[PDB]
Amino acid sequence: FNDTLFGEMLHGYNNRTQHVNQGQVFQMTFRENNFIKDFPQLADGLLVIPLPVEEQCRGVLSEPLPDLQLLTRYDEAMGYPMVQQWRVRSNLYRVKLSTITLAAGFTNVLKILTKESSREELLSFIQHYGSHYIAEALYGSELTCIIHFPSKKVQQQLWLQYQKETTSMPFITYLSGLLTAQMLSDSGVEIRCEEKGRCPSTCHLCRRPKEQLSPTPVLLEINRVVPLYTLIQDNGTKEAFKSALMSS
Amino acid sequence: FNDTLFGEMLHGYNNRTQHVNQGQVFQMTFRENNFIKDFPQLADGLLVIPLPVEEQCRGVLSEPLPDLQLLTRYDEAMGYPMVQQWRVRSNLYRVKLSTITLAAGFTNVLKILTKESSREELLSFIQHYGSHYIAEALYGSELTCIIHFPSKKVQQQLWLQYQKETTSMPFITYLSGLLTAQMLSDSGVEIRCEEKGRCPSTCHLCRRPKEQLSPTPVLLEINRVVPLYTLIQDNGTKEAFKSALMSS
């Protein structure tokens, strides 16, 4: 119901619970032709521009951090278990909102809320339409990887020896290769990766055991959010909104 | 895994996402006999006392508020649709925490976090064990009711005429009675109610179409929460904890 692609900027954002898609503040109109190549008609009022090719597909290897999640005692040889993060991003898109046309339902519920300021009613309004609406957002396909290690010396030895094998191929690729090496001769190590948004075939780093072309970019990360009270225009519900916003 | 009744005070509380039960900070021990009548052995360190009989089972009728959720235009006769809230509470319990014995895993992950202060590591620690632990909490069985009305004059007419019929029976009971009256002669009104925690047979207000005796009180509402950094004792991770706590 009332859901399109790019997409989630329309429905707003609840800020205390970090939930998106709640209520509809503007109207998805198809008058303007804000088209994107190889994608259908988009709602009006939003401006979307892909990331530069320099940062279109980029993989970051976060610093090796101990494994605290699965650790829930000091040992010199044994870990100190380590985990690694390898986050690549492909088909990334910026989305702005210039300039939006307001909906009738949201402005009407404002009107019935502007004329008389009430406590429980404003609280329920916040619980429905959230408390803020998003301005800029970053969509795309993100492959997040986590690597489990037994000790602290093992991932350092792999780090240095792989630094010597490379110095044509990156770290995680040959890492998975020598992982397939122990599958031939047997050690007890597992690698986990999950993707938010299916990844295109334009980038090699995110290919999966097939491949995909022009996938639907999912909401990766947030940028700049703007509150909802500054849109009501009358102070009697400005101070009531930002006042009832601090209770919980 | 590592879950008992009363219960959730042990696992902590994530504060930005309002999620409970994440990681284990203390140890559930059964040495002390903090027993409650008609309930098994409870973990040590917590003190639980039932609410007074005056507030043991209490039903509040919130002020009639317009129906904004289903409204997503001005009309004089028609609504302005209204909804009502009827929240009763039974088998309520206070829980405190005096005095708790710490776990080995949480103090160990602290130790490996106290000795060296790191950014990503402290962030992941917060994402696991939350950011705060709860001190006082209110459990019980809560019946929340919401009533849907078409107009603004209809629930006022029902309010006054029911005030005249009563002045032996409350509002919602005879309300449901005359609701069954229209089921005999036909209008298009529905009443919704949901319960968090099954309700005992000690109170009549929360009985359901059978009855239940001594149900397990669920976590109703929160009271006083205490942060987790003030428990690490060393400032090098105090300022690192409360500093990495403000980024997101």
Residue numbers in the entry:
A (entry chain A), B (entry chain A): 718 to 789, 793 to 887, 897 to 915, 920 to 942, 944 to 982
Lines from the paper:
The most distinctive features of MACPF/CDC domains are two loops containing α-helices which link the core domain β-strands and which undergo refolding in pore-forming family members to generate a partial or complete β-barrel inserted in the membrane. In ASTN-2, the first such loop (loop 1, linking strands β1–β3 and β4–β5), comprises 19 residues and contains a single-turn 310-helix (η1) and which packs against the Fn(III) domain interface (see below; see electronic supplementary material, figure S5 for sequence alignment and secondary structure). The movement of ASTN-2 through the endolysosomal system suggests that its activity might be regulated by pH. We have determined structures of the endodomain at pH 7.5 and pH 5 and of the MACPF/CDC domain alone at pH 4, and find the regions of ASTN-2 resolved to be remarkably insensitive to acidification. In an attempt to investigate the effect of reduced pH on the ASTN-2 structure, we obtained crystals of constructs consisting of EGF-3 to the C-terminus (residues 649–1288) at pH 5 and of EGF-3 plus the MACPF domain at pH 4 (residues 649–984), though in neither case was EGF-3 resolved in the resulting structures. For crystallization of ASTN-2649-984, the protein was concentrated to 15 mg ml−1 and crystallized in 0.1 M citric buffer, pH 4.0–4.5, 20% PEG 1000. The crystal structure of the MACPF domain C-terminus at pH 5 and of the MACPF domain alone at pH 4 were solved by molecular replacement using copy A of the structure solved at pH 7.5 in PHASER and refinement was carried out in PHENIX. The conformations of the lower pH forms of ASTN-2 are very similar to the equivalent regions of the neutral pH structure (RMSDs 0.23 Å (pH 5) and 1.52 Å (pH 4)).
Our focus here is on a PLP especially identified as being involved in neurodevelopment, astrotacin-2 (ASTN-2). Both ASTN-1 and ASTN-2 are integral membrane proteins in which a large C-terminal domain (extracellular for ASTN-1, endosome luminal for ASTN-2) is complemented by an N-terminal cytosolic domain suspended between two transmembrane α-helices. Thus, the endosomal regions of ASTN-2 comprise a smaller N-terminal domain and a larger C-terminal domain whose structure we report here and which we refer to as its endodomain. We describe its unique combination of a canonical MACPF/CDC domain with a minimal epidermal growth factor (EGF)-like repeat (EGF-4), a previously unobserved type of fibronectin type III (Fn(III)) domain in which an additional two β-strands are folded across the core, and an annexin-like domain.
